[PDB]
Structures are given as C-alpha cells and as structure tokens.
PDB file of C-alpha atoms in Angstrom:
ATOM      1  CA  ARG L   3      -0.026  -0.034   0.027  1.00  0.00           C
ATOM      2  CA  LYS L   4       0.878   3.761   0.391  1.00  0.00           C
ATOM      3  CA  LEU L   5       1.063   5.358  -3.002  1.00  0.00           C
ATOM      4  CA  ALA L   6       2.669   8.561  -1.845  1.00  0.00           C
ATOM      5  CA  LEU L   7       2.674  12.045  -3.196  1.00  0.00           C
ATOM      6  CA  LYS L   8       5.682  14.296  -3.097  1.00  0.00           C
ATOM      7  CA  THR L   9       6.435  17.885  -2.040  1.00  0.00           C
ATOM      8  CA  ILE L  10       3.619  20.277  -2.663  1.00  0.00           C
ATOM      9  CA  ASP L  11       3.967  24.072  -1.888  1.00  0.00           C
ATOM     10  CA  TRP L  12       7.458  23.482  -0.503  1.00  0.00           C
ATOM     11  CA  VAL L  13       8.207  27.164  -1.237  1.00  0.00           C
ATOM     12  CA  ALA L  14       5.437  28.151   1.143  1.00  0.00           C
ATOM     13  CA  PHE L  15       6.223  25.436   3.663  1.00  0.00           C
ATOM     14  CA  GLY L  16       9.895  26.097   4.637  1.00  0.00           C
ATOM     15  CA  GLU L  17      10.047  29.770   3.962  1.00  0.00           C
ATOM     16  CA  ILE L  18       7.222  30.793   6.351  1.00  0.00           C
ATOM     17  CA  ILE L  19       6.613  29.442   9.811  1.00  0.00           C
ATOM     18  CA  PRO L  20       4.833  30.143  13.010  1.00  0.00           C
ATOM     19  CA  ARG L  21       7.498  31.875  15.173  1.00  0.00           C
ATOM     20  CA  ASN L  22       6.478  29.860  18.197  1.00  0.00           C
ATOM     21  CA  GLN L  23       7.293  26.639  16.344  1.00  0.00           C
ATOM     22  CA  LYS L  24       9.907  27.869  13.912  1.00  0.00           C
ATOM     23  CA  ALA L  25      12.474  25.424  15.397  1.00  0.00           C
ATOM     24  CA  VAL L  26      10.047  22.572  15.086  1.00  0.00           C
ATOM     25  CA  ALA L  27       9.625  23.046  11.365  1.00  0.00           C
ATOM     26  CA  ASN L  28      13.322  22.325  10.686  1.00  0.00           C
ATOM     27  CA  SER L  29      13.001  19.128  12.774  1.00  0.00           C
ATOM     28  CA  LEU L  30       9.834  18.148  11.031  1.00  0.00           C
ATOM     29  CA  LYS L  31      11.216  19.173   7.630  1.00  0.00           C
ATOM     30  CA  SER L  32      14.178  16.893   7.934  1.00  0.00           C
ATOM     31  CA  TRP L  33      12.109  14.130   9.411  1.00  0.00           C
ATOM     32  CA  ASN L  34       9.955  14.228   6.260  1.00  0.00           C
ATOM     33  CA  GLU L  35      12.956  13.734   4.140  1.00  0.00           C
ATOM     34  CA  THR L  36      13.939  10.613   6.073  1.00  0.00           C
ATOM     35  CA  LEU L  37      10.494   9.129   5.544  1.00  0.00           C
ATOM     36  CA  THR L  38      10.577  10.094   1.826  1.00  0.00           C
ATOM     37  CA  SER L  39      13.805   8.454   0.764  1.00  0.00           C
ATOM     38  CA  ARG L  40      13.283   5.397   2.866  1.00  0.00           C
ATOM     39  CA  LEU L  41       9.782   4.614   1.581  1.00  0.00           C
ATOM     40  CA  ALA L  42      10.708   5.462  -2.068  1.00  0.00           C
ATOM     41  CA  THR L  43      13.252   2.726  -2.035  1.00  0.00           C
ATOM     42  CA  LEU L  44      11.547   0.022   0.041  1.00  0.00           C
ATOM     43  CA  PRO L  45       7.844  -0.775   0.083  1.00  0.00           C
ATOM     44  CA  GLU L  46       6.780  -3.722   2.184  1.00  0.00           C
ATOM     45  CA  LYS L  47       5.618  -6.320  -0.359  1.00  0.00           C
ATOM     46  CA  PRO L  48       7.107  -9.792  -0.534  1.00  0.00           C
ATOM     47  CA  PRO L  49       6.484 -12.687  -2.800  1.00  0.00           C
ATOM     48  CA  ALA L  50       4.058 -15.408  -1.898  1.00  0.00           C
ATOM     49  CA  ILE L  51       6.465 -18.373  -1.865  1.00  0.00           C
ATOM     50  CA  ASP L  52       6.774 -21.379  -4.159  1.00  0.00           C
ATOM     51  CA  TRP L  53       5.307 -24.144  -2.042  1.00  0.00           C
ATOM     52  CA  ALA L  54       5.067 -26.748  -4.803  1.00  0.00           C
ATOM     53  CA  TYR L  55       8.843 -27.212  -5.112  1.00  0.00           C
ATOM     54  CA  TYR L  56       9.359 -26.358  -1.476  1.00  0.00           C
ATOM     55  CA  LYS L  57       7.046 -29.260  -0.481  1.00  0.00           C
ATOM     56  CA  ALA L  58       9.282 -31.444  -2.572  1.00  0.00           C
ATOM     57  CA  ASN L  59      12.394 -30.484  -0.709  1.00  0.00           C
ATOM     58  CA  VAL L  60      10.743 -29.656   2.554  1.00  0.00           C
ATOM     59  CA  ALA L  61       9.659 -33.292   2.815  1.00  0.00           C
ATOM     60  CA  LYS L  62       8.034 -32.363   6.085  1.00  0.00           C
ATOM     61  CA  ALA L  63       5.200 -31.370   3.743  1.00  0.00           C
ATOM     62  CA  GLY L  64       2.442 -31.753   6.324  1.00  0.00           C
ATOM     63  CA  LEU L  65       4.195 -28.870   8.088  1.00  0.00           C
ATOM     64  CA  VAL L  66       4.527 -26.995   4.758  1.00  0.00           C
ATOM     65  CA  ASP L  67       0.863 -27.630   4.035  1.00  0.00           C
ATOM     66  CA  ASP L  68      -0.561 -26.669   7.443  1.00  0.00           C
ATOM     67  CA  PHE L  69       1.559 -23.526   7.872  1.00  0.00           C
ATOM     68  CA  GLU L  70       0.911 -22.842   4.164  1.00  0.00           C
ATOM     69  CA  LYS L  71      -2.895 -22.633   4.503  1.00  0.00           C
ATOM     70  CA  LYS L  72      -2.805 -20.532   7.673  1.00  0.00           C
ATOM     71  CA  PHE L  73      -0.456 -18.030   6.121  1.00  0.00           C
ATOM     72  CA  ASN L  74      -2.299 -17.724   2.811  1.00  0.00           C
ATOM     73  CA  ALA L  75      -5.535 -17.032   4.590  1.00  0.00           C
ATOM     74  CA  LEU L  76      -3.829 -14.761   7.016  1.00  0.00           C
ATOM     75  CA  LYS L  77      -4.364 -11.036   7.136  1.00  0.00           C
ATOM     76  CA  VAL L  78      -2.265  -8.268   8.637  1.00  0.00           C
ATOM     77  CA  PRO L  79      -4.310  -5.184   9.518  1.00  0.00           C
ATOM     78  CA  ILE L  80      -3.588  -1.482   9.050  1.00  0.00           C
ATOM     79  CA  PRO L  81      -0.968  -0.714  11.608  1.00  0.00           C
ATOM     80  CA  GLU L  82      -1.731   1.894  14.243  1.00  0.00           C
ATOM     81  CA  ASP L  83      -1.425   5.624  14.271  1.00  0.00           C
ATOM     82  CA  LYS L  84      -1.169   8.253  16.966  1.00  0.00           C
ATOM     83  CA  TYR L  85      -2.214  11.536  15.308  1.00  0.00           C
ATOM     84  CA  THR L  86      -5.748  12.203  13.941  1.00  0.00           C
ATOM     85  CA  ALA L  87      -6.932  15.102  16.039  1.00  0.00           C
ATOM     86  CA  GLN L  88      -4.042  16.842  14.344  1.00  0.00           C
ATOM     87  CA  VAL L  89      -5.933  16.278  11.117  1.00  0.00           C
ATOM     88  CA  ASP L  90      -8.493  18.641  12.763  1.00  0.00           C
ATOM     89  CA  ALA L  91      -6.276  21.052  14.670  1.00  0.00           C
ATOM     90  CA  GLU L  92      -5.408  21.970  11.074  1.00  0.00           C
ATOM     91  CA  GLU L  93      -8.648  23.527  10.019  1.00  0.00           C
ATOM     92  CA  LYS L  94      -8.666  25.218  13.469  1.00  0.00           C
ATOM     93  CA  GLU L  95      -5.265  26.857  12.872  1.00  0.00           C
ATOM     94  CA  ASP L  96      -6.464  27.201   9.334  1.00  0.00           C
ATOM     95  CA  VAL L  97      -9.383  29.378  10.474  1.00  0.00           C
ATOM     96  CA  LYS L  98      -6.692  31.449  12.173  1.00  0.00           C
ATOM     97  CA  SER L  99      -4.807  31.928   8.920  1.00  0.00           C
ATOM     98  CA  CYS L 100      -7.846  32.798   6.886  1.00  0.00           C
ATOM     99  CA  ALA L 101     -11.031  33.941   8.655  1.00  0.00           C
ATOM    100  CA  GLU L 102      -9.158  35.046  11.772  1.00  0.00           C
ATOM    101  CA  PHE L 103      -6.610  36.714   9.398  1.00  0.00           C
ATOM    102  CA  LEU L 104      -8.736  37.052   6.289  1.00  0.00           C
ATOM    103  CA  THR L 105     -11.230  39.348   7.914  1.00  0.00           C
ATOM    104  CA  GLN L 106      -9.123  41.294  10.481  1.00  0.00           C
ATOM    105  CA  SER L 107      -6.360  41.737   7.943  1.00  0.00           C
ATOM    106  CA  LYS L 108      -8.688  42.458   5.050  1.00  0.00           C
ATOM    107  CA  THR L 109     -10.180  45.380   6.934  1.00  0.00           C
ATOM    108  CA  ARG L 110      -6.748  46.808   7.828  1.00  0.00           C
ATOM    109  CA  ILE L 111      -5.608  46.658   4.179  1.00  0.00           C
ATOM    110  CA  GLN L 112      -8.853  48.163   2.934  1.00  0.00           C
ATOM    111  CA  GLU L 113      -8.647  51.305   5.090  1.00  0.00           C
ATOM    112  CA  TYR L 114      -4.909  51.779   4.548  1.00  0.00           C
ATOM    113  CA  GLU L 115      -5.510  51.875   0.783  1.00  0.00           C
ATOM    114  CA  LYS L 116      -8.637  53.874   1.187  1.00  0.00           C
ATOM    115  CA  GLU L 117      -6.416  56.427   2.932  1.00  0.00           C
ATOM    116  CA  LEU L 118      -3.759  56.021   0.323  1.00  0.00           C
ATOM    117  CA  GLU L 119      -5.308  58.377  -2.214  1.00  0.00           C
ATOM    118  CA  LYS L 120      -5.176  61.261   0.240  1.00  0.00           C
ATOM    119  CA  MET L 121      -1.749  60.232   1.550  1.00  0.00           C
ATOM    120  CA  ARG L 122      -0.424  58.847  -1.732  1.00  0.00           C
ATOM    121  CA  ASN L 123      -1.388  61.829  -1.630  1.00  0.00           C
TER     122      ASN L 123
ATOM    123  CA  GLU U 117       7.782 -15.179   9.095  1.00  0.00           C
ATOM    124  CA  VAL U 118       6.635 -17.937   6.724  1.00  0.00           C
ATOM    125  CA  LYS U 119       9.910 -18.651   5.133  1.00  0.00           C
ATOM    126  CA  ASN U 120      11.587 -19.370   8.531  1.00  0.00           C
ATOM    127  CA  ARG U 121       9.032 -22.054   8.915  1.00  0.00           C
ATOM    128  CA  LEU U 122       9.746 -23.808   5.727  1.00  0.00           C
ATOM    129  CA  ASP U 123      13.522 -23.424   5.745  1.00  0.00           C
ATOM    130  CA  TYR U 124      13.724 -25.315   9.040  1.00  0.00           C
ATOM    131  CA  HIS U 125      12.063 -28.372   7.421  1.00  0.00           C
ATOM    132  CA  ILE U 126      14.237 -28.162   4.341  1.00  0.00           C
ATOM    133  CA  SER U 127      17.359 -27.888   6.298  1.00  0.00           C
ATOM    134  CA  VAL U 128      16.655 -30.939   8.336  1.00  0.00           C
ATOM    135  CA  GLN U 129      15.832 -33.045   5.334  1.00  0.00           C
ATOM    136  CA  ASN U 130      18.936 -31.722   3.559  1.00  0.00           C
ATOM    137  CA  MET U 131      21.087 -32.463   6.527  1.00  0.00           C
ATOM    138  CA  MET U 132      19.333 -35.889   6.949  1.00  0.00           C
ATOM    139  CA  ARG U 133      20.317 -36.759   3.352  1.00  0.00           C
ATOM    140  CA  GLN U 134      23.903 -36.088   4.300  1.00  0.00           C
ATOM    141  CA  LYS U 135      23.662 -37.759   7.704  1.00  0.00           C
ATOM    142  CA  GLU U 136      22.194 -40.840   5.910  1.00  0.00           C
ATOM    143  CA  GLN U 137      25.141 -40.457   3.550  1.00  0.00           C
ATOM    144  CA  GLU U 138      27.672 -40.386   6.473  1.00  0.00           C
ATOM    145  CA  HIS U 139      25.932 -43.184   8.381  1.00  0.00           C
ATOM    146  CA  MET U 140      25.187 -45.248   5.231  1.00  0.00           C
ATOM    147  CA  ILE U 141      28.889 -44.585   4.140  1.00  0.00           C
ATOM    148  CA  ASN U 142      30.086 -45.854   7.523  1.00  0.00           C
ATOM    149  CA  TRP U 143      27.591 -48.637   7.538  1.00  0.00           C
ATOM    150  CA  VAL U 144      27.903 -49.827   3.981  1.00  0.00           C
ATOM    151  CA  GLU U 145      31.767 -49.613   4.347  1.00  0.00           C
ATOM    152  CA  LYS U 146      31.326 -51.525   7.681  1.00  0.00           C
ATOM    153  CA  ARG U 147      28.948 -54.033   6.194  1.00  0.00           C
ATOM    154  CA  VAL U 148      30.624 -54.689   2.922  1.00  0.00           C
ATOM    155  CA  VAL U 149      34.300 -54.994   3.900  1.00  0.00           C
ATOM    156  CA  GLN U 150      34.569 -58.563   5.116  1.00  0.00           C
ATOM    157  CA  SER U 151      34.403 -61.590   2.863  1.00  0.00           C
ATOM    158  CA  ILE U 152      36.318 -59.962   0.111  1.00  0.00           C
ATOM    159  CA  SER U 153      39.126 -62.558   0.205  1.00  0.00           C
ATOM    160  CA  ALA U 154      36.531 -65.320   0.394  1.00  0.00           C
ATOM    161  CA  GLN U 155      35.954 -64.314  -3.175  1.00  0.00           C
ATOM    162  CA  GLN U 156      39.549 -65.218  -4.191  1.00  0.00           C
ATOM    163  CA  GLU U 157      37.975 -64.390  -7.551  1.00  0.00           C
ATOM    164  CA  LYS U 158      38.290 -60.694  -6.781  1.00  0.00           C
ATOM    165  CA  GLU U 159      42.048 -61.368  -7.058  1.00  0.00           C
ATOM    166  CA  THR U 160      41.204 -63.519 -10.026  1.00  0.00           C
ATOM    167  CA  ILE U 161      39.383 -60.552 -11.524  1.00  0.00           C
ATOM    168  CA  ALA U 162      42.552 -58.761 -10.648  1.00  0.00           C
ATOM    169  CA  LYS U 163      44.650 -61.552 -12.128  1.00  0.00           C
ATOM    170  CA  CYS U 164      42.039 -60.965 -14.916  1.00  0.00           C
ATOM    171  CA  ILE U 165      42.586 -57.500 -15.596  1.00  0.00           C
ATOM    172  CA  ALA U 166      46.323 -58.023 -14.630  1.00  0.00           C
ATOM    173  CA  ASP U 167      46.906 -60.457 -17.474  1.00  0.00           C
ATOM    174  CA  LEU U 168      44.854 -58.083 -19.496  1.00  0.00           C
ATOM    175  CA  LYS U 169      47.397 -55.466 -18.269  1.00  0.00           C
ATOM    176  CA  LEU U 170      50.587 -57.372 -18.713  1.00  0.00           C
ATOM    177  CA  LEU U 171      49.020 -58.457 -22.123  1.00  0.00           C
ATOM    178  CA  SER U 172      46.852 -55.360 -22.784  1.00  0.00           C
ATOM    179  CA  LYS U 173      49.502 -52.830 -21.593  1.00  0.00           C
ATOM    180  CA  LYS U 174      52.049 -53.789 -24.147  1.00  0.00           C
TER     181      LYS U 174
END
C-alpha cells in the first residue's frame, strides 16, 4: 500500500513558519526527508512463496501444508497511528490563517489603501 | 515469518540426506568390507585385468 505524493507548496512550507514553532519546522522538515527516501526505495511487499517445489524439498510437507494454508488465509491489519486530532487542529489553525486573518487583515488593508489616495497623496 | 518455517524443514531433510550419507557410508563400508578374500575371484578378476594389463599394456 501507500502510494505517496511528493512535496507540494514547498516554497510556502519552509520559508514561512509560526514563530512559536519555527524550530520545530526544521526538525519536522528533515524528518519528512527521512520518511521520503526510505519509503521510495523500500515498500513492504514480499512474494508469496513457491510451495510446490518447496514441499518437494521440505519433505516435512504436512508442516509446509498446514503452515501454508494458515499463512495464505492470514491477514495483517492496518498498523496503528497516533495523530488524527491533528488532522483537525489543522482547520482550526487554518481558520486562524484565513477567517481570523482574512477578515481582520482584510479590513486593515482596505482602510490603509482607502487612505492612500489622500496620503499617496 | 513464513519462510523461516519452511527453511527449518528443508534444512533438516537436507542434513538428513547427508547424515544418511555419512551413516550409510560408514555402515555400507562397515557391512561390505569382510568376505572380500572369500571371493579369491576378486584377485582372479585382478589377475584378470592383470593378465589383460601385462597383455593389454604392451
């Protein structure tokens, strides 16, 4: 699994941070790189094993057979996470960017320019 | 996790074929090694080939 996408908006990412986390970004930035290169090279997908021959030369076939079935039916689940309220704290900090900043900032800019004619002059 | 399973079996059977070779080798060599001379004709077949050496060598 995990068809991954690469760096999107990397110009915006690195170049502009929350001051209160600015350090973190570097740490997270470099962490990402680690994950990137590692995954790109190795995905976890093995073969499914040639039993037929193996049974021949694992003459303990009953073993081969029993283990064989249990494996082939076997399922490994989706391994666990630890962040998924982050998913949400995004939109919340995202409100702060936009709305919180959209509106408040938008008003500021409007007046300034509205003044600018007189003072531009 | 699977392969480890299988390889243990293989490796025993492989080793068992060699151990059967070593034990069979010792046993066959210990079984057949006796009445050789009781066939004096195994020195006749030497004499055989030896007259066919001393003839068929020149």
